[PDB]
Design a binder for these strands. Sequence first.
RNA 1: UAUCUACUUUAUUCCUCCCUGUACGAAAGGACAAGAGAAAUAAGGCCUACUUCACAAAGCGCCUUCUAAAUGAUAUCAUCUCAACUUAAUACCCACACCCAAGAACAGGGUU
Lengths: 285, 115, 152, 59, 217, 111
Amino acid sequence: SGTWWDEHLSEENVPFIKQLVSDEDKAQLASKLCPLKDEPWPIHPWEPGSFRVGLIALKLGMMPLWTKDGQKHVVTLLQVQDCHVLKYTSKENCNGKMATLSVGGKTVSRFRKATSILEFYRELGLPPKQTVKIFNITDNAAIKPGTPLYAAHFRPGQYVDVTAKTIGKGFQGVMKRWGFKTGDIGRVWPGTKMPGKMGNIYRTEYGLKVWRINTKHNIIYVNGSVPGHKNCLVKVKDSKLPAYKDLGKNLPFPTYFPDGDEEELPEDLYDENVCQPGAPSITFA
Amino acid sequence: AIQKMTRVRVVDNSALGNSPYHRAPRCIHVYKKNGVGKVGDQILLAIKGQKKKALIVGHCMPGPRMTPRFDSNNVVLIEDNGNPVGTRIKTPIPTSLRKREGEYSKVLAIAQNFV
Amino acid sequence: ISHGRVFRRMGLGPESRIHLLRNLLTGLVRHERIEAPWARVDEMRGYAEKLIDYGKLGDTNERAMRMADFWLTEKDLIPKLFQVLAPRYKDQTGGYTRMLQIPNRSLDRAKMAVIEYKGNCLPPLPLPRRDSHLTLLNQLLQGLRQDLRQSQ
Amino acid sequence: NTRHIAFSGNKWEQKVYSSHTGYPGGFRQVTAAQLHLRDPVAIVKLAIYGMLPKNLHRR
Amino acid sequence: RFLSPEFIPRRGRTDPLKFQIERKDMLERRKVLHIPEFYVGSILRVTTADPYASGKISQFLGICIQRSGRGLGATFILRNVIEGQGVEICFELYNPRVQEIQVVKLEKRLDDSLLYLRDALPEYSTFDVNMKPVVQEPNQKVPVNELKVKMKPKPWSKRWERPNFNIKGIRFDLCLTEQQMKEAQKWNQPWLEFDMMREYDTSKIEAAIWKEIEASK
Amino acid sequence: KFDIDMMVSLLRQENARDICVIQVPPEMRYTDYFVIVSGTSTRHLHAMAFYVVKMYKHLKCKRDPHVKIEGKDTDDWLCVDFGSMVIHLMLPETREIYELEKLWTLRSYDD
RNA sequence: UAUCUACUUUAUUCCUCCCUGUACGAAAGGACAAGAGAAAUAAGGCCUACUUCACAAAGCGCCUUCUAAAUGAUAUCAUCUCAACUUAAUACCCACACCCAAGAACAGGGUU
Ligand SMILES: [Mg+2]
Ligand SMILES: [Mg+2]
Ligand SMILES: [Mg+2]
């Protein structure tokens, strides 16, 4: 037989285990709030040509955002929920071209994971995240594994690339999937467009302007549309577009640290062109 | 969207418009790559057996928000060189003609009203 | 693609699914316990609890009496819904029904279910009990609860 | 030392290695020099692989 | 109490925190600009800056004929005919180039959406541009104006006779035959009014939203 | 700056043949100043068009948008719009038939 | 009424504008490039609004789209040299039961 966690517990012991395990998840998330009062890794300044970490965010939904020129910009919200660095692998052990950081988001039940994963997070000292994405990264940006990543890792004005599974449409035919509808060739070429399973694949939207970040609720407000349904987990990295490869001067280079306590951030950073709520009604004079 | 074959309500003080005729004036060609015209496009137009260039001033399918939407396909005639046939335009004209690239300054001197 | 489509499509149309569910709900107000196939039962379970929430709006309410007049095809059950079922559940705010699975139907092997209304005169169902608090694992966890209470 | 091979004559510039990704329009002819800059094993590897008897013991 | 429809979410499996954020921005706009109570019958005049004129504003007056949209991006479209021409504008309620929204004549019509006014007589859609805002008294319910309008001939915008529209502001007796009426009662769906799983109860939603309103004060 | 005074400088400095401007009131949300000016011929109107866009372009106002001359191919009419003002270079016969000076003073009080 | 083979997720263009009415020409004439725009198509997404509609799916809607020189031998000059010398892919992906934005079945995600 196979079991589940709840199977042999009495009526008395089920909310006891809920309060116990939930409280250890809150304590483990609370202990990691001081990365710099811990012993971090050596923080380097930004060098031209270095890459830093990305994030994993919920897609909250969309809302409009008017700029000072009186144009709408549809904006997805992306909440950062319990994002943390999980493992650093150098380039020598990776046998890739570059070092890698594994980062995971959205705490998920301990009662529903493989035991290799629970041993991993147990040794690491964290409640297990839903997704773990991997970031190609230079040696200069390498935060210690077990450190929180926040919304202000990105700043307004920055352009960003977001990857998520697209909304799966299940098995679709040619007209919806591909949008249409030789003799001597006695066969159908590979990559021919035929009916099949549409969606539920990873796609990346490239070069999306960050308009506004909300430091309190940890929201990123990104231009336009991101792949995936609502409440989906997206991987938010800095854009690879070569028109945007050098603007890492002003971005906090390892990551943003509220523990650093230096010139703390407001409620919500806005881009310069954003009409804030509470500003007087804009006139084009 | 004013495509081919659409009936067109000409708003002018022109001789061609306000003349009575057995056929309603209807579009023939739209001067975009796709054959769909919006507020501030040029079309060919059949009036009294005479094809004639024309400029779309407001249509019935909704555009962006703060812009107006008419209950007819109001169209102002124009000549080949670019100056309009008309002298007065009675029905209101959207200000969205101002930003678009093309001949619009000539028409905005003629409007009685602006919406 | 049926994302967020919440209703089973049943019977031979929307009208016919509402008449199937209305017959099941009438059966369950009358007999207070029903075997029926499973998908039909949980569709109708949604409707059943709402029907009591209209029963608590009072006999004298006009809207409640319209809903009861539609949903109960036998008209003698409308005094029952406003004087037996709605006074029974006047304390608790939800959870008026319980649904379990029967073994599959002998005829065509359909997934079967029972719903009853809670607190009826009928012999009780063999409800799935949790394991006893005096078992080995439950006593280890009881001891652990005693230690974490001893922390204060 | 298979980076340090030595073709005789103009075989660096004339000899062509043609492959096909099975997709349409996926025919890829690449000279010996370009393929030797991609991977400095593949020229000796393709030579040997052509010399061996065309059967199942080959791989 | 009147809670404007843009605060009530449509049901859906989105996260309540997103509406916490939206309502925060919506109230922060309602500090600057005064958004009044108005229904789907009322005559409005809106002053907007123009993106095409250099900081000149404008006024449009008409009937709010629809209050669609929820959240910060919510709209209302008002209608008027001028110069023998019908015009409608979709106004975004929280677009920061609107300066004032004055309610000329607060009144509620029989329907929730007066889109049938596109097919009525143009006298039911025309209004004075310089008309004066009628004074309402502070402590009173709204005047529910009923006005069964008269309809222009049969090829309408939509078949308003059909009972999925539930149109009340029509004198159907003047402009429709009894045979076509009884034909229109084919698409009735009488059960649809009586199912209890389609009914979205916004009551506790209203509670948390009114504590959002009071807490922003 | 590039005001209407500077426009009078550009046109009397060109010796435009005929000048008549209207201050458009701010409600009629097209422009502020509505210049009606005629010249000799197509060469004259054309050259004074390129002159006034030459002087506005060369003068100041980098952040302000570059301005396209409208109706370069037509003969009688020409028109150029700025932020505050819009000039119409045309012919006095064309002025006679389009009667613009009546329109922007009589918005509903003419034919 | 599909048995077998094969197969079923490998950014362009137009117009405008500027640079510039400069370069070049001597006058007529008149650039490139790069930049900003607006469009359109294709590709990939998405639903905040609008529209068909309404716990969602859509488009008519929105978002994104990255051989030529010098030098110089044969043939002491020269000569672009089937003469020699010198010079001009990143991204993506990677660990029972119930509900599901996952789904034909199987699979997948969630169940604190
Ligand atoms: Mg063959
Ligand atoms: Mg069936
Ligand atoms: Mg229609």
